[PDB]
Amino acid sequence: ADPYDALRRRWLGITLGTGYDPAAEPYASRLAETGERAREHRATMAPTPTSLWPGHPFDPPAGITFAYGRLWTMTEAYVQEGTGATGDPALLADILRGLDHLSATVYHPATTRYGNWWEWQIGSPRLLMDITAALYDHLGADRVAAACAAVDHFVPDAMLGAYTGTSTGANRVDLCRSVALRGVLGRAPAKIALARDALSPVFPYVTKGDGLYADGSFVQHTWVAYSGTAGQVMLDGLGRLFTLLAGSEWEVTDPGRQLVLDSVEHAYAPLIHDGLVMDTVNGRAISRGYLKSDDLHVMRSDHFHGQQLIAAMAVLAGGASNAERERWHARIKGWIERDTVTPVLTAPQFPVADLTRLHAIADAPGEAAPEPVGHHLFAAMDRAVHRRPAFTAGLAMASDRIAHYECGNGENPRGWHTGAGMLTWWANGTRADQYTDWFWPTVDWYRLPGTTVSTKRLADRAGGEWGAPKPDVRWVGGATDGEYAAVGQHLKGLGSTLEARKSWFFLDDAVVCLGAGITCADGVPVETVVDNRNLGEGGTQALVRGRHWAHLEGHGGWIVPGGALRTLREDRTGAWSDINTTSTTERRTRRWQTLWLDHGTDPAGADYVYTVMPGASRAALARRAADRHWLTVLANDDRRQAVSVPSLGLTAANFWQAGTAGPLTTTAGASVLVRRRGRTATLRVSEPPRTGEALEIVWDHPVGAVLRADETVEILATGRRLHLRVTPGVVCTTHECEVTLS
């Protein structure tokens, strides 16, 4: 009918959800809880020249936002079925008095802003608009017009002008949201259109600093890999607006919008496993667990963050094409089926609108999609993710672009080595709670899985907060064909003289890990942590040691040739408060199985070889341990590290400098993957140092003719050898060339 009516109602569908049964669980419990809190706020509401609730003053301005936040909850009790206060006139009268009092006292066009800009331009107006929308029919024309004028005053048009300062990224999105709503409720088309338009500069990929990158990475705080939690914010915020405006005269039509939509499968989905989103992209938030300020007592964890990120995808899906919706829902349905740790459909933190969208997804006909097999290298944030039938793995590195770790606001004080080549993993089709079940509050932060560290003692927050500490290196990245990968990290340890070359070769049922050039002058032992597994409370999983191997029941195994493997099993006790000033002091005990290699004190060019086989059975492990022809280490030194795997027709090489490994030669630091498939071979090369200088590769193998090659790849010779000249760019893109053999 009317276009403003269609938006208002669509927004209420988005904010409150639609078409569920308020008498069914879990809705019924969420609605009752909103009722119960609304009664407590109504009982305590007390209007005075300086507050609306006692103890929350209007200066500092957080007191204003705090007041609107409670009137919102009161509104929800008013409009929703099953709260035990649905449609109660006395509750209505109290929301009114509270709104009038804020309007009359602080939040109006005569007040010149004080303190934190965010409370006036984001916190408060986003709630005022939602209240005005939910209570549109009960508020009268003067209140509606006065809410609009207040928004015009605190968020003028100019706040949607220059894309800078407090008006970028998530801030820009949330500013548009208020303007858009003010347009809808005040029936002002120009404000809607300005909201629509001011979304545009959020769409393009960035190439430095905060934002989404073309390769799918997502960075925040300038240096910190942050897809896990900051991604939730950008998808939910944009998701709300794309959905609101879809089908209307102000629908987003900017072709950039496709980069937002593409991000769901290209940036976020690969970091989601059976419901969790990987702690390698959760920054300091890995340390929260039970928050002291959280009255619902819901543990933060990789699953909790995953649930939020999944919910946000389900929001954006109303703003996408049909074909997109049907792919995204199929993925979400798969996650909903596989997450046995924190059941998505009954997650306690979900409000009913999120519950509604996720149940509609689970109740629809259509595939539950499995996570596809493959490899995603997020080079711009130094992250990799590998999936095979037997397991899922996530790797965290650090470079001159990406912090070793973030600490700040009293969180994550010991996260120093989470960037030191940390290799996290899950065995597929087992409960996916390895990092969820009080992993972080109990772990030994000096022996994170996969890493090489000096055992040197470090202070809490060593290196500085907010992602200040970055190793002084360039070569961090790799090459992939979307299925297998050569990844390498030139490591300088946090707060240490440690320097090391670490490589990972992600194969079909294993990751082969090579290290070389391990050099330290700290005066203390240096370790490589072959693994460190949380076993849960009182775990009795058998550890069996053949081989040069060990196998951990329920987990997988490790092959370490040349012996000297150490192991320790021990119980460790801790509390989230040990790693977060804002978390509770409740304690748990967890048992741990830790494996490592001891490089001695002051190593000078030490090295290692090990293979981890996540998810492997005992028997698969004993056979691979006895098999000495499946893998050849072609080179393992500080000039180059390289493997040959005949069963995959695979040659993989990290060149730390010009050199030769097996049949490959390069003029410069490069990562190279060659795959031979009968009569065809594909070559992939990237340049992780990112100098962008042209480099040459020679593959000593007879090749017939070139089938295809990227523009950036020049063919210098075929016949007896293949000789390429690659102009590689500065973002560690993998360049491709496919040739017929021989």
CATH superfamily, domain at 1-371: Chondroitin AC/alginate lyase (1.50.10.100)
C-alpha 593/C-alpha 434 separation (Å) is: 12
H/E/C letters for each residue in 272-308?
Answer: EECCEECHHHCHHHHHCCCECCCCCCCCCCHHHHHHH
Assess contact for 625 and 549: CB atoms under 8 A. yes
Between the alpha carbon of residue 378 and those of residues 83, 267, 268, 733, the distances in Å are 45, 8, 11, 10
Q: Output phi, psi for 684, to 5 deg.
A: -130, 135
Is residue 41 within a helix (H) or strand (E), and if so which, with residue range?
helix 27-44
Q: How many whole angstroms separate alpha carbon 729 and alpha carbon 5?
A: 50
Experimental method, per PDB record: X-ray
Cα-to-chain-centroid distance, residue 700: 40
CA of residue 1 relative to chain centroid, distance: 41
* Pair of tokens at residue 3: 């276009």
Residue given tokens 């509401």 in the structure block: 45
* Resolution given for this structure, in angstroms: 2.3
Residue 19: helix, strand or coil by DSSP?
Answer: coil
Give the separation between CA 77 and CA 92, rounded to whole angstroms. 10
Q: Is 460 exposed, middle or buried (0-12, 13-18, 19+ CB in 10 A)?
A: exposed
Q: How far apart are CA 381 and CA 245, in angstroms?
A: 32
User: What's 339-363 look like in SS3?
Assistant: CCCCCHHHCCCCCHHHHHHHHHHHH
Distance (Å) of CA 259 to CA 170, 180, 216, 323, 448: 16, 22, 10, 16, 35
DSSP 120: I
Give the CA angle between residues 41, 60, 97 to the nearest 5°: 35
Q: In whole angstroms, how far apart are CA 70 and each of 96, 128, 712?
A: 13, 11, 58
* Under 8 Å between Cβ of 236 and 15: no
Assess contact for 537 and 554: CB atoms under 8 A: no
Look at the domain 372-627 and name its fold: Beta-galactosidase; Chain A, domain 5 (2.70.98)
End-to-end CA distance of the chain: 69
Distance, CA of 57 to CA of 200 (rounded, Å): 37
**Is residue 543 a contact partner of residue 590, using CB atoms and an 8 Å limit?**
no
Give the CATH superfamily of 628-742.
Polysaccharide lyase family 8-like, C-terminal (2.60.220.10)
* Token code pair at residue 213: 């990158």
Residue 518, judged by CB atoms within 10 A of its CB (0-12, 13-18, 19+), counts as buried
CB 464 within 8 A of CB 428: no
Peptide bond into 270 cis (omega under 30): no
Backbone phi, then psi, for 147, in 5-degree steps? -55, -45
Cβ atoms of 225 and 283 within 8 Å: the answer is: yes
CA atoms of 420 and 441, how far apart (whole Å): 19
Q: What is the dihedral of CA 177, 182, 184, 186, to 10 degrees?
A: 180
Shortest CA distance to 717 belongs to which of 694, 689, 686, 739?
739
- Six token digits for residue 405: 């770790």
DSSP-derived secondary structure letter, 187: T
Contacts of 33 (CB under 8 A, 6+ apart): none
**Beta carbons within 8 Å of 740's beta carbon, 6+ residues apart:** 679, 680, 703, 704, 705, 706, 707
| Structural tokens at position 546 | 């053949």
Sorted by sequence, the CB contacts under 8 Å of residue 725 that are 6+ apart come out as 694, 695, 696, 713, 714, 716
Pair of tokens at residue 622? 């004993």
Strand partners of residue 502: 489, 515
Q: What is the largest CA-CA distance in the chain?
A: 89
Distance between CA atoms of residues 190 and 194, nearest Å: 6
Give the residue extent of every domain in the chain: 1-371, 372-627, 628-742
